[PDB]
Amino acid sequence: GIVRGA
Amino acid sequence: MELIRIAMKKDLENDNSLMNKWATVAGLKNPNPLYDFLNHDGKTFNEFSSIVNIVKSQYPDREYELMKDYCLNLDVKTKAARSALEYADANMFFEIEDALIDSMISCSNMKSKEYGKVYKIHRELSKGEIDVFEASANIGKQRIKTAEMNIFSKMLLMYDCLNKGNFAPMMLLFQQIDLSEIKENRYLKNSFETRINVLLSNIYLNENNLELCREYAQKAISSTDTQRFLVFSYLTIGTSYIFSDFNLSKQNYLIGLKFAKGNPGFEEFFKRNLSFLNNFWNKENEWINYDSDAVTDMQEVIFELINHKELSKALQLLNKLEERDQNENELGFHYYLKGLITNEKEAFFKSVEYFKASQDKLSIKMPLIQLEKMGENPRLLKIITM
């Protein structure tokens, strides 16, 4: 998977 | 008596020119509130950016120790403490944040009680101590009165959407936020403006609006010097290039990685996406975490095995993962990999359904390309991405 974060 | 006061008193007797230098760095009109801050305990600047900008430029390497000491000594009933809570949350300084929350929940100022309660909800949500449904319930139970906490309650849920791979609610939540409604606290408005920007950047990244995505990430990078915002900004820019341009993608991930030095949590995000990038482009991969039990990490080991044409070893490792709880977005990749291994159209359709469910307009390209290779209508596949 791709990981994301803000 | 607070470490920073002692540090500044010490540096001031050695160098008289520091008053004017600190006055301009703190955005002050004249050196007076500085004198007050150094002498009368309890004095706090009108704007919290005053203390952060002094700390950042004068004691670059002692920020955490100095800031932790400042914050634990603050009167919880004041605008300063409310700003410190935002500062601590924005940087992910969880020890500072949890102790401010504890003392803000108990106190007798209504505004500080509200900030305490909402940030606790955000913290309990990031830690899995509650889920979205209790979060929403608790937010309403609070009957929020400030514009800020109203806004922060929207962002709170957006962060959860983001790590649960459920991207549909987020543009909807974004649209409910209006920053010009926050009036008293200038610092909090700035911090939020920056939080929104990376949030917005993610929203566009998932909507496959790649130019706007980089616009907002860069906007954040330009105006901040807080490590957390740098990290996620670069993370995002790099993901925006994962499918278009290998070198641009690698370079942003490496820039971000340098900004993450000595914070293992932030480093992990980059290692993961560098893993994916190199697997996807079929380059040699120094980034794979071979002994993590995390679903995203096992997926990388499988994707590598697929590139080394070890289809039998890959299939066994993939069956082991069907056992495990995954979100909709993770199932997206799962079924994509099942497809590359098995060459079944079925696996790819599932992959498209999951990326649709989670509304990841970015990753959907992969199984779509694969379906086009196996003879499915190309016009119809174009309409699916519209």
Author numbering:
A (entry chain C): 1 to 6
B (entry chain A): 1 to 386
How did the manuscript describe this experimental structure?
The arbitrium system is employed by phages of the SPbeta family to communicate with their progeny during infection to decide either to follow the lytic or the lysogenic cycle. AimR is a transcription factor that in its apo peptide-free form promotes aimX expression.
The AimR-AimPKat asymmetric unit contains two AimR molecules arranged as a dimer, with one AimPKat bound to the TPR domain of each AimRKat protomer. The dimeric organisation in solution for the AimR-AimPKat complex was confirmed by SEC-MALS. Having the structures of AimRKat in its apo and AimPKat-bound conformations, we not only analysed the mechanism of peptide action but also whether it corresponds to any of the two alternative mechanisms proposed for AimRSPβ. Further, due to the reduced proximity of the subdomains, new interactions are produced between TPRN-ter and TPRC-ter that tie the protomer in the compact conformation. The distance between the DNA recognition helices (α3) in the AimR-AimPKat dimer is only 60 Å, a reduction of more than 20 Å in comparison to the apo AimRKat form. In the AimR-AimPKat structure, the peptide binds to the concave side of the channel formed by the TPR-like repeats, and it establishes hydrophilic interactions at both N- and C-terminal ends, anchoring AimPKat in an extended conformation. AimRKat has an Asn at position 273 (N273) that anchors AimPKat V3 by interacting with its N and O backbone.
